């Protein structure tokens, strides 16, 4: 009867039950600790609302979508068997108000989405999406899905550590470095004598630290590092000094260490290397008045600075002395708690007194940017971090999905496997099938390709699955099977490597074979859990010309009520880290919803992209779209004598009518403006011509973000000749272009803090290469912190006037680079 546990293993892609790589019982304690939060949210959720999961928002409907509505009236076409009749509806009308307009529940045609619950129809996401693209809200009169399908299975000494020695099975002078750590701050540091580097080095040394046992804070790491020499860090490993039972660590440790290929999230992990046979190990032993004017200004200038501006000792001493004034400002919080001398018992006590009186904090409107900072690598105190998770509680489900990726990554900054943030995600996952779905893949993604955090994420996922219900479990099981069957086919085809013609039949042969053998004939599309894909479309399946040879696959829609003929196009790629692409795209989504708060819609295409396993995942195929290079290839040819008039020409020939050409050119100016701003800010602006795409309908969009004389971003004359210009001129559309860009840019600057943090966290948990202070401190320059609105406008307009002044130089330089 434990085959349920064996199933969970195969759904997770890691066995929680295994204990070959522990040196204590933290993981198991956290399994057993999560049972309560699991069963609480399970028991408290509404069965029917959980089944239908209405994807709803509570946000204002922006200016752009109102001016689309035909005067306080919205048409909704309802379907029976084949009896479609349209109905007049007012933005405020309830799903209930339309059910007694003419127990049956409304379901979107084609999708596994529902229009139910006490919110107006203007508050449903599906409706807002129809209007966005200008489409009609078709919906079937259905039976509510059965909740039964969702059912669940039921002391004043100084600290000291003895370094016995290091041991490596295989393989010129080496020394161990021991740091008492706390939130990236190193509190005390001791070194060994440097011995000769051989497969085994013994020291038998007591390293006396100056910090006392009482002064140790919970969440402090003993960080053991190995340097050789000209010095270089070669190996690292960590050990929580205070354990999950608030107990001081004691005894003998043989800890297997991580190697090395500046901040990186992997460097913080309490996980030990699972590879006993190849990794370096270490052997250790634990036995053991109210303020004046001039200063208020100084304090307020400090509070004003961006999250990345370093505080000096002077700044910190001031913040701490004025604890209580600093407390009256929610924005002082990250700076204030980074002024705490965490390696001093009485100070932390005072810090806790200060926390116990956070009336201003608790009453303030949620600031996601501010909250995030408290969950990054700079904070190891659980009580500090808990006030952040506290603030997240108020997020509506719609806003969790916006931040879900980075909150899931934020877990890599937690000292302990059991944390407020982990419980939060768990809770908010079990309450909403949608958050649940994505939470599953997000965790699975990291479990597959990261040893530093798989053990932890696996515990959190198992906790989630044990509460999602039989329906979800079946769905998940079905999704895994498919991508596991398909990934095998991708790896095999890549090995038969220009694309052969016989190899297309090789692919089509194996896809036919799977159609019978084991493949489930329907599954949820992981990047769009609304859509259920069914049987394949073998004729349309191929291998793309790309040298990473990905699978272009198309699927029939398994839902008969689907009111379309279009297949479901998924790319299957191996060879790249798609985790990076997810992050960028999710930031892109954040950028959009920001622009929504100011009634803008810059028509980005942040297509679906899920990293399913090790260096291999899947991607949404945008319909009726092609790359900019191919447009230049069909008129100009191979070598690329880039012609300025080809794009607008291509837009004309894909525009059916004059009516559609206006809205196409207009969607280009919008989408182009967004991608120029977004990429400039993220520093992924200077991009190859073949990495940018357009839809037949005007929508531009960048692809392949994981791909990473210069230029700010991509603004070329062929783009500009859709904006009545070349070299030196100004049209009514180019004025609009600048009028959208400069407003998009200072619009992001109204959210500087948030993007800075999101950027930091992205580099630390997802870009495992360089990421030093300097890497991160690019977005400060890009967003011109401190600079006024007027100066920054001229900064961005100069960027344009570099792309203008560069013409084709950079695109051309890519050609001599990539192609030749
Ligand atoms: C109608 C049509 O063709 N629509 C498309 N829609 C999308 C949506 C996304 C992507 C895409 C995005 N990111 C990465 Cl990393 C990739 N990787 S890839 O290897 O498939 C690829 C790398 C470059 C290159 F020029 C073509 C494909 C692919 C490609 C396409 S094609």
From Swiss-Prot:
Pancreas, skeletal muscle, liver and heart. GO terms for molecular function: 1-phosphatidylinositol-3-kinase activity; 1-phosphatidylinositol-4,5-bisphosphate 3-kinase activity; 1-phosphatidylinositol-4-phosphate 3-kinase activity; ATP binding; ephrin receptor binding; identical protein binding; protein kinase activity; protein serine kinase activity. It comes from the Eukaryota. Disulfide bonds: none annotated. ATP binds at residues 569-578, 604-612, 701-708. The modification Phosphothreonine is found at residue 752. GO terms for cellular component: cytoplasm; cytosol; membrane; phosphatidylinositol 3-kinase complex, class IA; phosphatidylinositol 3-kinase complex, class IB; plasma membrane. Pathway: Phospholipid metabolism; phosphatidylinositol phosphate biosynthesis. Residues 71-143 form the PI3K-RBD domain. It catalyses: a 1,2-diacyl-sn-glycero-3-phospho-(1D-myo-inositol) + ATP = a 1,2-diacyl-sn-glycero-3-phospho-(1D-myo-inositol-3-phosphate) + ADP + H(+); a 1,2-diacyl-sn-glycero-3-phospho-(1D-myo-inositol-4,5-bisphosphate) + ATP = a 1,2-diacyl-sn-glycero-3-phospho-(1D-myo-inositol-3,4,5-trisphosphate) + ADP + H(+); a 1,2-diacyl-sn-glycero-3-phospho-(1D-myo-inositol 4-phosphate) + ATP = a 1,2-diacyl-sn-glycero-3-phospho-(1D-myo-inositol-3,4-bisphosphate) + ADP + H(+); L-seryl-[protein] + ATP = O-phospho-L-seryl-[protein] + ADP + H(+). Its EC number is 2.7.1.137, 2.7.1.153, 2.7.1.154, 2.7.11.1. The keyword NADP does not apply. Changing residue 687 to P: Abolishes protein and lipid kinase activity. Does not abolish interaction with GRK2. Its main location: cytoplasm. The keyword Phosphoprotein applies. Keywords: Angiogenesis, ATP-binding, Cell membrane, Chemotaxis, Cytoplasm, Disease variant, Endocytosis, Immunity, Inflammatory response, Kinase, Lipid metabolism, Membrane, Nucleotide-binding, Phosphoprotein, Serine/threonine-protein kinase, Transferase. Belongs to the PI3/PI4-kinase family. Heterodimer of a catalytic subunit PIK3CG and a PIK3R5 or PIK3R6 regulatory subunit. Interacts with GRK2 through the PIK helical domain. Interaction with GRK2 is required for targeting to agonist-occupied receptor. Interacts with PDE3B; regulates PDE3B activity and thereby cAMP levels in cells. Interacts with TPM2. Interacts with EPHA8; regulates integrin-mediated cell adhesion to substrate. Interacts with HRAS; the interaction is required for membrane recruitment and beta-gamma G protein dimer-dependent activation of the PI3K gamma complex PIK3CG:PIK3R6. This is Phosphatidylinositol 4,5-bisphosphate 3-kinase catalytic subunit gamma isoform. It comes from Homo sapiens.
């Amino acid at each position: 009867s434990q085959a349920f546990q064996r199933q969970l293993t195969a759904l997770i892609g890691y066995d929680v039950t295994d204990v070959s790589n522990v040196h204590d019982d933290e993981l198991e304690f956290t399994r057993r600790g999560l049972v309560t939060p699991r069963m609480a949210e399970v028991a408290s959720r509404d069965p029917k609302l959980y089944a239908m999961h209405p994807w709803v928002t509570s946000k204002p409907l922006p200016e752009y979508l109102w001016k689309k509505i035909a005067n306080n009236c919205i048409f909704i076409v309802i379907h029976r068997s084949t009896t479609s009749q349209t109905i007049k509806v007012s933005p405020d009308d309830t799903p209930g108000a339309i059910l007694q307009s003419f127990d049956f529940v409304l379901r979107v045609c084609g999708r596994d989405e529902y229009l139910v619950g006490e919110t107006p129809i203007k508050n449903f996401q599906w409706v807002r999406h129809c209007l966005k693209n200008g489409e009609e809200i078709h919906v079937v009169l259905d039976t509510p899905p059965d909740p039964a399908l969702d059912e669940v299975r039921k002391c004043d000494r100084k600290f000291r550590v003895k370094i016995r020695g290091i041991d490596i099975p295989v393989l010129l002078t080496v020394f161990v470095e021991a740091n008492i750590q706390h939130g990236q701050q190193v509190l005390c540091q001791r070194r060994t004598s440097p011995k000769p580097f051989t497969e085994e080095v013994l020291w038998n040394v007591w390293l006396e630290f100056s910090i006392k046992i009482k002064d140790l804070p919970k969440g402090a790491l003993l960080n053991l590092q190995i340097y050789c020499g000209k010095v270089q860090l070669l190996y690292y490993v960590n050990l929580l000094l205070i354990d999950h039972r608030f107990l001081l660590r004691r005894g003998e440790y043989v800890l297997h260490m991580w190697q090395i290929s500046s901040f990186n999230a992997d460097k913080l992990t309490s996980a030990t290397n699972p590879d006993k046979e190849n990794s370096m190990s270490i052997s250790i032993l634990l036995d053991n008045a109210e303020m004046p004017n001039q200063l208020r200004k100084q304090l307020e200038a400090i509070i004003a600075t961006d999250p990345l501006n370093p505080l000096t000792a002077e700044d910190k001493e001031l913040l701490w002395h004025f604890r209580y004034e600093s407390l009256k400002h929610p924005k002082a919080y990250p700076k204030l708690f980074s002024s705490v001398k965490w390696g001093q018992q009485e100070i932390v006590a005072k810090t806790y007194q200060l926390l116990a009186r956070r009336e201003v904090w608790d009453q303030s409107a949620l600031d996601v940017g501010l909250t995030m900072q408290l969950l990054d690598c700079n904070f190891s105190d659980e009580n500090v971090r808990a006030i952040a998770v506290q603030k997240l509680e108020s997020l509506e489900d719609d806003d969790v999905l916006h931040y879900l990726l980075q909150l899931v990554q934020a877990v890599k900054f937690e000292p302990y496997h059991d944390s407020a943030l982990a419980r939060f995600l768990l809770k908010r996952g079990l309450r909403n099938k949608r958050i649940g779905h994505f939470l599953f893949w997000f965790l699975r993604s990291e479990i597959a390709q990261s040893r530093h955090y798989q053990q932890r994420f696996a515990v959190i996922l198992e906790a989630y699955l044990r509460g999602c219900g039989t329906a979800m479990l079946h769905d998940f099981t079905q999704q895994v099977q498919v991508i596991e069957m398909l990934q095998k086919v991708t790896l095999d085809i890549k090995s038969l490597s220009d694309v052969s013609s016989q190899v297309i039949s090789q692919l089509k042969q194996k896809l036919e074979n799977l159609q019978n053998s084991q493949l489930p004939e329907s599954f949820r599309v992981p990047y769009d859990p609304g859509l259920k894909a069914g049987a394949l479309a073998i004729e349309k399946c191929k291998v793309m010309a790309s040298k990473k040879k990905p699978l272009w696959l198309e699927f029939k829609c398994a839902d008969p009520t689907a009111l379309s003929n279009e297949t479901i196009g998924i790319i299957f790629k191996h060879g790249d880290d798609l985790r990076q692409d997810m992050l960028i795209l999710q930031i892109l989504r954040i950028m959009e919803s920001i622009w929504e708060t100011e009634s803008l819609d810059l028509c980005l295409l942040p297509y679906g992209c899920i990293s399913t396993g090790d260096k291999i995942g899947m991607i949404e195929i945008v319909k009726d779209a092609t790359t900019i290079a191919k447009i230049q290839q069909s008129t100009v040819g191979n070598t690329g004598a880039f012609k300025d008039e080809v794009l607008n020409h291509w837009l004309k020939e894909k525009s059916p009518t004059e009516e559609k050409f206006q809205a196409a050119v207009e969607r280009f100016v919008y989408s182009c403006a967004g991608y120029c701003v977004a990429t400039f800010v993220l520093g992924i602006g200077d991009r190859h011509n073949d990495n940018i795409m357009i839809t037949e309908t005007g929508n531009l969009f960048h692809i392949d973000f994981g791909h990473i004389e210069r230029v700010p971003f991509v603004l070329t004359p062929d783009f500009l000749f859709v904006m009545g210009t070349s070299g030196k001129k100004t049209s009514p559309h180019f004025q609009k272009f600048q009028d959208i860009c400069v407003k998009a840019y200072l619009a992001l600057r109204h959210h500087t803090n948030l993007l800075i943090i999101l950027f930091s966290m992205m580099l630390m948990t997802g870009m495992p290469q360089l990421t030093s202070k300097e890497d991160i401190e690019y977005i400060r320059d890009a967003l011109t912190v401190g600079k006024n609105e007027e100066d920054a406008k001229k900064y961005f307009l100069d960027q344009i006037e570099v792309c203008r002044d560069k013409g084709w130089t950079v695109q051309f330089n890519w050609f001599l680079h990539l192609v030749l």
